Amino acid sequence: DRELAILATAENLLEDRPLADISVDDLAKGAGISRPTFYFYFPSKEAVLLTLLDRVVNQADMALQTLAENPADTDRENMWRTGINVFFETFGSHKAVTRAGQAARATSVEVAELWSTFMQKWIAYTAAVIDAERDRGAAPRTLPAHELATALNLMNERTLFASFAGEQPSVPEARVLDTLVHIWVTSIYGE
């Protein structure tokens, strides 16, 4: 309620500057409440970013769970594309939260642990699907599936987020999905 207003204010302000330049007073004003009233909702501006990141991470996670439960009727290249696309659209639709949440991994144990927990979950699901593809005879038994899954997930983390931030260097945002799908499909199905 007022919680949603604080979160919306923070996501808005993060589009024009870093969390280090946003004061508890800034978040209070945008939500139509006082500073002490802010502390009834959150202990710190750091907790507000942790909550925004938690919401975006869980949105991606539930979108991937939806795809897992509702297999698309398409070839294996388009199957992998739908999965990568969850992360491209979810994080790419919340660039300021993505940028600030990644930066906070350096200074917040809670943000680092959240990121680590979900990356472990997404890697495990990737490996399980590679294993299923090997079990059905579509993919060759090359690298250990979990190691391959880990490197492909870390590739997507660095490459998506560099593209969203317009880093130099980066893959243009309009090319990054096709780029990652190519590398996933060749490395999963290639002898």
Add this chain to the structure above:
Amino acid sequence: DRELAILATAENLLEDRPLADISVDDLAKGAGISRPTFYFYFPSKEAVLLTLLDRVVNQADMALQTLAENPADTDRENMWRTGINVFFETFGSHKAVTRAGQAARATSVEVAELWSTFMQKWIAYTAAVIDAERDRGAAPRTLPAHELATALNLMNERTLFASFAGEQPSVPEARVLDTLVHIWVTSIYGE
């Protein structure tokens, strides 16, 4: 001389704690000089880390230039392995400088610009070799070479450095070279 002693002290202290916990006084003592004498060599402890990172980055760069000028007589999988191995051995032999240098990208424009300049150089060289492989008919014309090169370089950055830091998640350090070579070779030569 005393410069080399300051650099060695800093690389030593970075193995047990972050630069934020190392004082100009710490570096001065280990080099056998006073604090004001330290400032004759470097303006800041941040400049000392910038110099250590510059040395390691240039070591990798010159090792890659050496391989480029002295082609190994081996198959294309071993050719790509020798190149990735430059980064695995160079950065993997200087883990504390790697970890601290990557962390400083967030707060030092000079460190960010150094990292960006060399990543651009290594990506450009990767693309030129993929192009040569396509020109000779060994690799298929799939993705734009520069986009493929960028994603493979960013994969190696995130995956090598997570492995060196023992992040969760990470590829074990003893598996990371084979993991990356597989992904490079399948994505470069795969239809």
